[PDB]
Each structure stands twice: as structure tokens, then as C-alpha cells.
């Protein structure tokens, strides 16, 4: 079913495929990062604000 080595390495092997079509390979790779919500967006925006502030301070 899903556990007991039937589906985990199944997913790993299915993902680890040749993907001859270039668009297919790109869509396979893009299916790796989870989507984001508003709180994550504002938190990452705060992190980027801190990063650019630190870059300005370095300058």
C-alpha cells in the first residue's frame, strides 16, 4: 500500500527518472518546493529587509 517499503522508494525511483522532455524535467524539478502563505511571505520579507539593511551597513 503506502508503508512497508512499497511506496517510499517507489516515489524516490519515480522521481529519479530520465525525463527526456525538457519541459517535463523542469516541471519535475519545480514540484519540489512547497507553496507559501501570507505569514511565510511576510516573514521572508522581514528576512530580506534585514539582509538588505545589513548590506547597506556593510557598504
Amino acid at each position: 500500500e503506502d508503508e512497508s517499503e512499497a511506496l517510499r522508494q517507489a516515489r524516490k525511483d519515480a522521481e529519479l527518472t530520465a525525463s527526456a522532455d525538457s519541459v517535463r524535467a523542469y516541471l519535475k524539478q519545480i514540484g519540489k518546493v512547497a507553496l507559501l502563505n501570507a505569514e511565510e511571505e511576510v516573514e521572508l520579507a522581514k528576512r530580506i529587509e534585514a539582509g538588505l539593511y545589513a548590506t547597506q551597513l556593510m557598504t
Binding site: E1, A10, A14, S19
Partner: protein
């Protein structure tokens, strides 16, 4: 007969035909009627499948609707496809180059399931091209004809194969549905099976049946007798429905991790969903017949079902066991056998309806995509069907289909027969078909099912041999796409008049009889053994009581182009093939005399070709003129047929129409009123009746050459009016405007005499190669004015002449008088293309006489060019003194096996001189079966001969015996056909008699005037400096590598280098050679070809360091 104006054509036919030939255009008209859904077709299906009367457009609209959004609370549907009157009648759309078309209207229902509101908007679908009465479309003025296509009908196809290793038999299947993914079930080299899904070579049936919600108990219950599938299920090695689903996901959608539900829905969306796998309505019924699934149920759910898959498994596995009959649980029993792919029960025919349906389906798919995109981006209740609809893709798709598609081609019309045969022709190349390179040897062969459906003789001799053919004369297209032919059914040796129609597959389960059988009028064949066609196409003897079908008539297996060949049965198949093909390319002469010896098919072929005026309604003729005929019908009103005079055909021939009625005659509905280009008294006439001697004369008729007398040239017996058109357009340009004016720079006056001040040639003025036609002057802009030009103008006072005279001139090698000028312009408020503002087209015609090199041929396969036209003195003449017109060689007819035309020659002489059979002491033995009214024939009497039931040898010999003379007492020909004839060169009589008689010859459209070409220094191509090729361009013959082989073998090196470098390529070499030969100087040393430098640069651009080293 049965034609009101039919000339009296006596016939040698023995038996009668129970039915007349159907309207040979019925495969184009009826299909378009189905497409539109006209009331004629509406009532046609009322007794031929009224279970679901629906048109092609109605079917597509119903399939498309309803279309909704992701939420399902808002949707749109289509209904009521209503047409409209055509914008303009045919001739004007042929004049100003507009498509013969009418607006299309449909009703759109907007539904909003959230609250519910109705919006019935009558949207303008577009401009749908229509089909004319002749079955030809008009696109941009041109007349185009679409042809039906032969493809493999979607369904199930089992087949057998030998491994050639241990001689084990293997059985494979290919369920090939349109717009879907293939499944290939077979028995592998080893014992197990192969279940290839969409080209993936793994996973025997174990995972598939398991993936259908089953488990091992079901597959072991269904299959306990099939040890092959028992071994396979034992070799499952997988337990678990989800395990099988993920294993399928491996080899159906790799690259994405599988989940519990993804594979289960993926299988349904791949096979059992009618959006990604929909075998057409033909495919579902083909599967049902092949498997006996449903035998009395309406057609619905075009998508493939699971019981279909299980029945396919059972059928295949039982076939591997060698079983004969399979009975599916829940269905009738079906015999188990391999399916042939060329049998006409598996090859359908996509007529015009199906092709236009497919293009409309693509257009509606784009429509559904765009409307699905748009229905969500706009807020509810602010959206209307008009803004949901953007009709652009539909008209784009129809324009894509009608133009720049190889299945809807330019009409081949240089005589009525070519037009008739271009339609009702079956092709096999194109979208969904097989290319000639893709075509094997098996497909080109004649299948036993071709009989009565597709003619086995009519097919082009070129590379396309066998790929494209012509429809039979009695053939019918079922409302289902399969082809079908009529046949009378005999019961217990009693022949019935009831005509029933059978397809290719329905013929196997019956036994059809011979066409010309010894019928006694009581239905009983006098001998028990009769030639019959068995199930597998085998011919054999069989007693009479068990046969159940017979051919409706002879010439049922043959088309309309081959049914016009007299004495067909006496000719080899190859020569009959070529004769049928040359019948298509005869030219329309200026008189078109009817043939003496022919077949009854000529009248019907001429009548229904559509180019002869036929009185639709009976009545007296009010008045007759060359331009028009006014006919007064019985019910007061009148009708004026406007005759078409001197119209250029698509191949530049003549299409005059001469009325053949008087000012006070009565004409019945259906009678021929006026004759077309190649018709006499409403019957086909593609040639002339010429007296023939078959002796080989002094080598001028050597190797198929033909010699003619000057009488044909002087009496205009073989001369054709040929018309060409020359378009030329003045268009806007950054330099300004190009003017159609007489202000033509640096021209004389003797060549300006025949132009009007408007700037074009006077109507009725003679031109020739090089003469100016239209004076169009373009602003030259600027260039390097040579100093020598300045000294030139300083010597004479010539103006700069600031404009370039790129006027239109008659191209090389033609002449003749001008027929008409048509001019269009923007200030004439015309629909000119955006960019051009004048467009003038001039028609020039010349009465092309017959000369050396013109190809003349009979309709029996004999061909040849005119070796010479020698004067009337030097012609062998009979004792009466009439010179022979055409002499052909005798060394071709016995070797090439076309003796039929010798019989035609003798029958023609009998028909010309007239005959009478002495019925004093009873009728002679040979004339006992000869019909009455054929024992007497006046001079120049026309006869007829059906192709397979015609005049026999004994009857023709008896006719030759009594051949009463015309004016003097002189039986020129003896009983054996030969006749004495006097030499016109030396004067003494020839030692031995030779055969003479009247033969029907035709001039082919391969005249030498359009076939002679030569050039000294013309233009050259861009990339490589080689001269171009063709007749439109100045050309230049291709000196290929095969001729390079010959020149190298000769040992001639200087000639080869000359032909390569300076004569073709070396630019400086070309100009230097021309200067040297003009200057009378020695031709210089050839240089280096430019194409080699082009190759060197090209190879360098491919990252290949190529340098040529001096040392």
C-alpha cells in the same frame, strides 16, 4: 435509353440491367447534405436510420454542449444550427474571387446554476463555404474539389505472426481508436503475454486485470482453460490493487511520485474518459460487431468500456488456442479469426462530410478552450455569450482546411470526364493516411473486396499507383462511412428484382453469382455449376440451389472512366489502365464529334458531369440564341439559361457551350439543352472518328509513332482553343505609386499602336512572345547613374526618365488574340487585397493547331507522338480514292496486348459504311442472339457496346460479311476485314491488303508548344549561383550525377569541367565566357565553382576547421 433527348444508340447488350446507374455525383452531394442537415437529407434518413436523425454540425454542437466552469454553477450550450442564403450566386463569386459561402447561425443558451438566468443569443458562427450543384467548392474564385480518403476504421484488429525460430504462432491485437492511446495485447516469444500500453514494453496482463478492481480469483475463474494466461497469472509476482496501480504509474507517467488515488483516476482519464480516448461512433459499432457486445442497443458512450477490454482478452487468448467461436458472457457468439487490414470491411471512407466535421471539431475544441478560459475571468451576471464567443478559430480552421491542404485540391477540369473522375475518387494520402514512402507493397495491391466498390483498373501509373483510385459506377457510401454495393438476391434459383445493398464484410457470409449468367427469365441458371465469388474471394463452381446473390449488372466492378472503353474485356489490364488514364486528359476540340463505337455510359457521364445545360422543368422554347436560351414552362412562367461562352478552364482549355435546340421545339424535363466542351448531342465526345490503316509506313510510324494526313490540319479536325490569363497588380510602395499608364520610357511606336490610352492592349488585338501587355511604371528611386548615361543624354537630349518600366510582357513562346480584360481598383470600391490598388488580368487565346510532337491516343492504351504530317497525296487510299487520315504501326498491338482496338476499328468501319443482314431465308445462325433493329444500319450509324457484354467475335465477323456500300457498288473491305489500298507515293498497289476502319482518337493535353524550352543565359539562384529550374522561370536542364557518371565513363574531362564550372556556377567564368564568345575570342580557362566555396563556408560554420593548402 429512358432519357428524353437520348440519341438512338443501338446496343449489343444481351441482358437488361434491373436498375439504372445512380447519379455519379451522389457521394459529394449526399455527404454535404448530411453535413448541413438539409430537409432532403432529413427525409433521406427518415427511412434509413430515423432512430437518430442528426447532422454533422448538429452532432458536433451536441457533443460540444454543455461547457461549464470548474465550479459547475455556470455554463453554456449550443443548439439550432441554422444556415442562411448564399451571399452571391456562383458566377460572380467566380468573377471577383470570393468564396461561395453563406453565413452560419446558431443559438447559444447561457445557464447559471447558482441562481438561474437564461440568455438565448443567436451568435453569428461565421462564413461557411457551401457546395455547388456540381459538387465543387469555390475558394477565392478558384474552383477546388475535395476527395474522399481511405483510412483504417478505428476498432479492434487481431493478427497472426510466425516467430521464425521454433515456428510457434503468435497472435497480437491493436485496438486503434481515433484520438487515444493504443493498447497492444499479444503472446510474447515465451509463454506469457505482452500488454503494451502506449509503447511501454513491460507488465503482462496480471497488473491490468488486477487494476480493474479484480483480484486473483476473478482472473483464475475467467481463465482456467487457457494455460497460457494461467501461467501468466501464476507469474504475477504482485499482490495488491494499489501495488498494480503504482506499477502501472511507473510505465504510464514516470517522473512524478505516485499516490493512492492518482493511478486509479489516471487509468479512467486515459481510457474510460471520452476526452482523452474516444473511438468515434464508427469505432464503437465496429468493436460491438467484432465482439458481439451490443446487438440491439443505440449508439452512445463512445469511450471504451471495461467489458470491451475483457472481451478483447478472451478473444485474443482463445485465438491463440486455435478456437473457432467465442461466446462472451452477456452477448452473442462471434467467430474467432484474424482481421485483414486491407479488406474493405475495415477500411472506411472519410467523405467531405467527415473531413469538414473533423476540422469543425478542431475549431470547436479551440472554442471550448477559449470560452473555458474566459468564463471564469469575468464576474457572474456581467458575462454574455457574445463576449464568451470569439468565432476567429472556427473560420481560421475552415480556411486552413480548404486552402494549403493536400486532400482538397485544385479541380482537374480539361474535359467533362476529368471533372467527373476528380470527384468520386478515393485517395489514401494525407492527414491520417499513409505517405508513398510509408506505403508498402501490400497496400498497393488489389484486394478481393475491391470488387464492386473500387475500380481495379483506374489508378495513376506514377508513384501513386494503387494508393489512389476511383469509385465504382454502382457503389454507395453507407451513412456509416463504410462502402457498399447493390446486388440482386436469388432464392432457390429464382432471381428477384429486389435490390439489397451489401458491404464488404456482409459479402463473405453469402455467395454472389456471376454478372452475366445464363438467366432463363425464371430465375434458374441452365447449368448447376455457376461462376461465383466465395467468402475469401475464391472463385469456384457450385450448384445453383445454394447461391443467394448475384451481381446487379456487368460493369459493376469498373469505374466510369473505364466503362467508356469499348471491347474492354479483350484488353490487358495495364493497357486498359493507361487508356482509362488518358481518357482523363483529352482536350476539348472545336467541334467534338460523337464517337461511332462506344458505351452507354457516355450519355450518363456527359449528362451528370454538370457542364451541359439540362432543362429542369419541361416546356416549349420561347427563344434561342448563342448567349442564352429562354424556355417557356407549361405553368406560364419562363426561365432563361444564360449560356457560358469561351471560359478558361483550370488547365487553360476552352469551355464553350453551343445550344442544340430550335426556337419552336418542346423539351422535356431532364433533356439536354446545350452541349459542353466535349459533348455532342449531350453525350461524351473526347475525340474524332478517323480512318485508320494499320500498316507500318516507311518508318515514320516507328516505335509507337503515328502519322497523319494534312486533311486534319486543313479541315480543323484536331485543333484546340487554348486560353491563358496574365495577372498584374499595381500596389502602393514607399517610392510612391505604380501607374497603369502609357507613359512607358524608351519604347517605339509600332509596339504602342495596339494599346489604349488607359495603358492596356486593345481587345481583339494580336500579341506574341515579348510584346507588352499592360503599361505599369514604378518609381525607380535612385541608383548609380553612369557617366556614360550622362554623355548619352547629352547627345540626344533624352530625359532622365526617373521611373522604372517593369511592365507586363508576354512570356517566351506564346501568342494569340486577346479575349477579355478584367480590371479592379480601389476607387472602384472593390475588395482588393490590402496593399494593391490596381489589378488587371488579361485573357489571351490562340487556336492551337495540331503539329509534330503532339500526343494522340486511343482509349485502348495505344499512345504516340505525331511523327509527321505528310500531305494528302502521300497517303494510302482505297479503290474509292478516300485517303486514310491516321496511320499507326502494326508492331505494337500484338506485343503490347491491346487487340481490343482492332475489334473497335472493324466495328467502327461497319458502323460507318452501314450494314444489313439478309433476313430472307430466316435469320443467320450468328444473328440468332443478335437483337432486332441491329440487323439493319444506315451509313454513319452510331452503335454501342457494354464493356463486358458486347459484340462477340462471331457477331462482328457476320457484320463484316455484309457491309453494304454507300454510293457506288464497291465492297472495299473483304470478309476478313483487310482491304486493298493504293500507295500515294509510288502509285502501285500494295502487295497485300491491310486492315482499315474508323477509330476514335483523342488529342491529349501534352502539346509540344507547352513542352519546348531552351535558354542561353537566364537568372540564377541566391545561395548557390546555379540557374533555376522550370518553365515559369527561364529554367535550365538539370545535369545530375547520373549523367556525370556517363561523362566520366566517356573519358571526356574538359566537357565535364565546362558543364560544371563555367556553364553553371563560376560567375566570373560565366561573364568572361559570354564576352569571349561574343567578341569571337577563345573561351578562357574555367575557374573555381562558387558552390564549393559555399560548401566550405557552411562546413566552417559547423565548427570544422577546413583549409585548402597550396603546398
Amino acid at each position: 435509353n429512358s432519357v428524353p433527348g437520348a440519341p438512338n444508340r443501338v446496343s449489343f447488350a444481351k441482358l437488361r440491367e434491373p436498375l439504372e446507374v445512380p447519379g455519379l455525383l451522389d457521394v459529394q452531394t449526399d455527404s454535404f447534405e448530411w453535413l448541413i442537415g438539409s430537409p432532403r437529407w432529413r427525409e433521406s434518413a427518415a427511412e434509413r436510420g430515423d432512430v437518430n436523425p442528426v447532422g454533422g454540425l448538429e452532432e458536433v454542437l451536441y457533443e460540444l454542449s454543455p461547457i461549464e466552469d470548474f465550479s459547475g454553477s455556470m455554463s453554456l450550450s449550443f443548439s439550432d444550427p441554422r444556415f442562411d442564403d448564399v451571399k452571391a450566386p456562383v458566377d460572380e463569386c467566380k468573377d471577383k474571387d470570393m468564396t461561395y459561402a453563406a453565413p452560419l447561425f446558431v443559438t447559444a443558451e447561457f445557464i447559471n446554476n447558482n441562481t438561474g438566468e437564461i440568455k438565448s443569443q443567436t451568435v453569428f458562427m461565421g462564413d461557411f463555404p457551401m457546395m455547388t450543384e456540381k459538387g465543387t467548392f469555390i475558394i477565392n474564385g478558384t474552383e477546388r474539389v475535395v476527395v474522399s480518403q481511405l483510412v483504417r476504421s478505428p476498432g479492434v484488429y487481431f493478427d497472426e505472426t510466425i516467430d521464425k525460430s521454433t515456428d510457434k504462432t503468435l497472435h497480437s491485437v491493436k485496438v486503434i481508436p481515433s484520438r487515444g492511446a493504443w493498447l497492444e495485447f499479444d503472446v510474447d516469444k515465451r509463454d506469457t503475454v505482452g500488454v503494451r500500453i502506449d509503447r511501454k514494453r513491460r507488465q503482462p496482463v496480471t497488473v491490468l486485470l488486477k487494476a480493474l478492481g479484480w483480484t486473483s480469483e476473478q482472473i483464475v475463474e475467467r481463465f482456467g482453460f487457457s494455460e497460457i494466461m494461467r501461467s501468466t497469472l501464476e507469474k504475477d509476482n504482485t499482490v495488491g490493487t494499489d501495488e498494480a496501480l503504482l506499477d502501472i504509474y511507473r510505465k504510464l507517467r514516470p517522473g512524478e511520485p505516485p499516490t493512492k488515488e492518482s493511478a486509479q483516476t489516471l487509468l479512467e482519464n486515459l481510457f474510460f474518459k471520452e476526452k482523452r480516448y474516444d473511438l468515434a461512433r464508427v469505432g464503437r459499432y465496429k468493436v460491438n460487431k467484432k465482439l458481439g457486445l451490443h446487438v440491439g442497443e443505440p449508439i452512445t458512450s463512445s469511450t471504451l468500456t471495461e467489458e470491451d477490454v475483457v472481451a478483447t482478452i478472451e478473444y485474443l487468448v482463445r485465438l491463440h488456442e486455435g478456437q473457432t467461436t467465442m461466446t462472451v458472457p452477456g452477448g452473442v457468439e462471434v467467430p474467432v479469426e484474424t482481421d485483414d487490414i486491407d479488406h474493405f470491411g475495415n477500411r472506411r471512407l472519410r467523405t467531405v462530410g467527415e473531413l469538414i466535421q473533423n476540422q469543425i471539431r478542431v475549431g470547436m475544441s479551440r472554442m471550448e478552450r477559449v470560452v473555458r478560459e474566459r468564463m471564469t475571468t469575468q464576474d457572474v451576471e456581467a458575462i454574455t455569450p457574445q463576449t464568451l464567443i470569439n468565432i476567429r478559430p472556427v473560420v481560421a480552421a475552415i480556411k486552413e482546411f480548404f486552402g494549403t491542404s493536400q486532400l482538397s485540391q485544385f479541380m482537374d477540369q480539361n474535359n467533362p470526364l476529368s471533372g467527373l473522375t476528380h470527384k468520386r475518387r478515393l485517395s489514401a494520402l494525407g492527414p491520417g493516411g499513409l505517405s508513398r514512402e510509408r506505403a508498402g507493397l501490400e497496400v498497393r495491391d488489389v484486394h478481393p473486396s475491391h470488387y464492386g466498390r473500387m475500380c481495379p483498373i483506374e489508378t495513376p501509373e506514377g508513384p501513386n499507383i494503387g494508393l489512389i483510385g476511383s469509385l465504382s459506377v454502382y457503389a454507395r457510401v453507407n451513412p456509416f462511412g463504410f462502402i457498399e454495393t447493390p446486388y440482386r438476391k436469388v432464392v432457390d434459383g429464382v432471381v428477384s428484382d429486389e435490390i439489397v445493398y451489401l458491404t464488404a464484410d456482409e459479402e463473405d457470409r453469402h455467395v454472389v453469382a456471376q454478372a452475366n449468367s445464363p438467366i432463363d427469365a425464371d430465375g434458374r441458371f441452365v447449368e448447376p455449376r455457376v461462376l461465383v465469388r466465395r467468402k475469401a474471394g475464391e472463385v469456384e463452381y457450385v450448384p445453383s440451389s445454394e447461391v443467394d446473390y448475384m451481381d446487379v449488372s456487368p460493369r459493376q466492378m469498373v469505374s466510369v472512366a473505364t466503362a467508356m472503353i469499348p471491347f474492354l474485356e479483350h484488353d490487358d489490364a495495364n493497357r486498359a489502365l493507361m487508356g482509362a488514364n488518358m481518357q482523363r486528359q483529352a482536350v476539348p476540340l472545336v467541334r467534338s464529334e460523337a464517337p461511332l463505337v462506344g458505351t452507354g455510359m457516355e450519355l450518363r457521364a456527359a449528362i451528370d458531369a454538370g457542364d451541359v445545360v439540362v432543362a429542369e422543368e419541361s416546356g416549349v422554347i420561347e427563344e434561342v440564341s448563342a448567349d442564352y436560351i429562354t424556355v417557356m414552362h407549361d405553368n406560364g412562367t419562363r426561365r432563361t439559361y444564360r449560356m457560358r461562352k469561351f471560359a478558361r478552364s483550370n488547365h487553360g482549355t476552352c469551355a464553350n457551350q453551343c445550344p442544340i435546340v430550335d426556337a419552336g421545339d418542346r423539351v422535356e424535363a431532364g433533356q439536354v439543352i446545350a452541349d459542353g466542351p466535349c459533348t455532342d448531342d449531350g453525350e461524351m465526345a473526347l475525340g474524332k472518328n478517323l480512318l485508320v490503316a494499320i500498316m507500318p509506313w516507311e518508318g515514320h510510324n516507328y516505335e509507337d509513332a503515328i502519322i497523319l494526313s494534312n486533311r486534319l490540319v486543313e479541315e480543323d479536325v484536331l485543333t484546340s482553343i487554348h486560353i491563358e490569363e496574365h495577372e498584374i497588380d499595381a500596389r502602393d510602395t514607399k517610392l510612391g505609386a505604380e501607374e497603369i499608364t502609357r507613359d512607358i520610357p524608351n519604347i517605339s511606336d509600332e509596339v504602342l499602336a495596339d494599346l489604349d490610352e488607359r495603358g492596356i492592349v486593345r481587345i481583339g488585338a494580336e500579341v506574341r512572345d515579348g510584346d507588352i501587355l499592360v503599361g505599369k511604371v514604378t518609381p525607380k528611386g535612385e541608383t548609380e547613374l553612369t557617366p556614360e548615361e550622362r554623355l548619352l543624354r547629352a547627345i540626344f537630349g533624352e530625359k532622365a526618365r526617373e521611373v522604372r518600366d517593369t511592365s507586363l510582357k508576354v512570356p517566351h513562346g506564346e501568342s494569340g488574340k486577346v479575349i477579355g480584360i478584367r480590371v479592379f481598383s480601389r476607387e472602384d470600391e472593390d475588395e482588393l487585397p490590402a496593399g494593391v490598388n490596381e489589378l488587371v488580368r488579361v485573357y489571351v487565346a490562340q487556336k492551337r493547331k495540331i503539329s509534330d510532337g503532339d500526343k494522340l491516343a486511343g482509349r485502348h492504351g495505344n499512345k504516340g507522338v505525331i511523327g509527321k504530317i505528310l500531305p494528302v497525296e502521300d497517303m494510302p487510299f482505297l479503290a474509292d480514292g478516300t485517303p486514310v487520315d491516321i496511320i499507326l504501326n502494326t508492331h505494337g498491338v500484338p506485343r503490347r496486348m491491346n487487340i481490343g482496338q482492332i475489334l473497335e476499328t472493324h466495328l467502327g468501319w461497319c458502323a460507318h459504311s452501314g450494314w444489313k443482314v439478309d433476313a430472307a431465308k430466316g435469320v443467320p445462325d450468328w444473328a440468332a442472339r443478335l437483337p432486332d433493329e441491329l440487323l439493319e444500319a444506315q451509313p454513319n450509324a452510331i452503335v454501342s457496346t457494354p464493356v463486358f457484354d458486347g459484340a462477340q467475335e462471331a457477331e462482328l465477323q457476320g457484320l463484316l460479311s455484309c457491309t453494304l456500300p454507300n454510293r457506288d457498288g464497291d465492297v472495299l473491305v473483304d470478309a476478313d476485314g483487310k482491304a486493298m489500298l493504293f500507295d500515294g507515293r509510288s502509285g502501285e498497289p500494295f502487295p497485300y491488303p491491310v486492315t482499315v476502319g474508323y477509330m476514335y482518337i483523342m488529342k491529349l493535353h501534352h502539346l509540344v508548344d507547352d513542352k519546348i524550352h531552351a535558354r542561353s543565359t537566364g537568372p540564377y539562384s541566391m545561395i548557390t549561383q546555379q540557374p533555376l529550374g522550370g518553365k515559369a522561370q527561364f529554367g535550365g536542364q538539370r545535369f545530375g550525377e547520373m549523367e556525370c557518371w556517363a561523362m566520366q565513363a566517356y573519358g571526356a574531362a574538359y566537357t565535364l569541367q565546362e558543364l560544371l564550372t563555367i556553364k553553371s556556377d563560376d560567375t566570373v567564368g560565366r561573364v568572361k565566357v559570354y564576352e569571349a564568345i561574343v567578341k569571337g575570342e577563345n573561351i578562357p580557362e574555367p575557374g573555381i565553382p562558387e558552390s564549393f566555396k559555399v560548401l566550405l563556408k557552411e562546413l566552417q560554420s559547423l565548427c570544422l576547421n577546413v583549409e585548402v593548402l597550396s603546398s
